[PDB]
Amino acid sequence: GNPLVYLDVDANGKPLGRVVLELKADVVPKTAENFRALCTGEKGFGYKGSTFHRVIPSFMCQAGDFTNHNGTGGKSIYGSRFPDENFTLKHVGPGVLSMANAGPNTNGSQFFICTIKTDWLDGKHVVFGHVIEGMDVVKKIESFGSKSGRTSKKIVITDCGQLS
């Protein structure tokens, strides 16, 4: 079946707990595969040690820039950027996992977890999974965001990987 992956998250160096994500490889295999491998780190790079650098309450929590840690960087397992696979899955509500981008066909490694329905992102961002467990952790992360996206605590993915 679809991969289950995890992110263990600290805030200011103390654990918040674990976010478990189902990756919809059946709908978006290339996008799911990229995220999966970045969680295990099997290509020699990935999310371990990186941050949630942009968090906006009542919107989303963004992470995945493991090269620049500021929203400008990241890379995929395929190369620096890869195409929008499809827009089949929609931003239906809290828990949606979707690719951040800088316009059409600029997926790299940055991703966001929604804390609300973000319907205006349908057809613009590739949705590729959702939160199975740990929405409480996501709400904690969300609570350390701001209007500008600037975080008030240092939010770090200390560990990540694949469960199944």
UniProtKB/Swiss-Prot annotation:
It catalyses: [protein]-peptidylproline (omega=180) = [protein]-peptidylproline (omega=0). Acetylated at Lys-124; deacetylated at Lys-124 by SIRT3. Inhibited by cyclosporin A (CsA). Is displaced by CsA from the mPTP leading to a lower open probability of the mPTP. It is found in: Mitochondrion matrix. The modification N6-acetyllysine is found at residues 24, 124. Coiled coil: none annotated. The modification S-nitrosocysteine is found at residue 160. Residues 6-162 form the PPIase cyclophilin-type domain. The modification N6-succinyllysine is found at residues 24, 43, 132, 147. Keywords: Acetylation, Apoptosis, Isomerase, Mitochondrion, Necrosis, Rotamase, S-nitrosylation, Transit peptide. Its EC number is 5.2.1.8. The keyword Acetylation applies. GO terms for biological process: apoptotic mitochondrial changes; cellular response to arsenic-containing substance; cellular response to calcium ion; cellular response to hydrogen peroxide; mitochondrial depolarization; mitochondrial outer membrane permeabilization involved in programmed cell death; necroptotic process; negative regulation of apoptotic process. GO terms for molecular function: cyclosporin A binding; peptidyl-prolyl cis-trans isomerase activity. It is an enzyme of class 5 (isomerase). GO terms for cellular component: cytoplasm; membrane; mitochondrial matrix; mitochondrial permeability transition pore complex; mitochondrion. Associates with the mitochondrial membrane ATP synthase F(1)F(0) ATP synthase; the association is increased by inorganic phosphate (Pi) and decreased by cyclosporin A (CsA). Interacts with ATP5F1B; ATP5PD and ATP5PO. Interacts with SLC25A3; the interaction is impaired by CsA. Interacts with BCL2; the interaction is impaired by CsA. Interacts with TP53; the association implicates preferentially tetrameric TP53, is induced by oxidative stress and is impaired by CsA. Interacts with C1QBP. Interacts with MCUR1. Belongs to the cyclophilin-type PPIase family. PPIase that catalyzes the cis-trans isomerization of proline imidic peptide bonds in oligopeptides and may therefore assist protein folding. Involved in regulation of the mitochondrial permeability transition pore (mPTP). It is proposed that its association with the mPTP is masking a binding site for inhibiting inorganic phosphate (Pi) and promotes the open probability of the mPTP leading to apoptosis or necrosis; the requirement of the PPIase activity for this function is debated. In cooperation with mitochondrial p53/TP53 is involved in activating oxidative stress-induced necrosis. This is Peptidyl-prolyl cis-trans isomerase F, mitochondrial. The lineage of its organism: Eukaryota, Metazoa, Chordata, Craniata, Vertebrata. The chain holds residues 44 to 207 of 207 of the full protein.
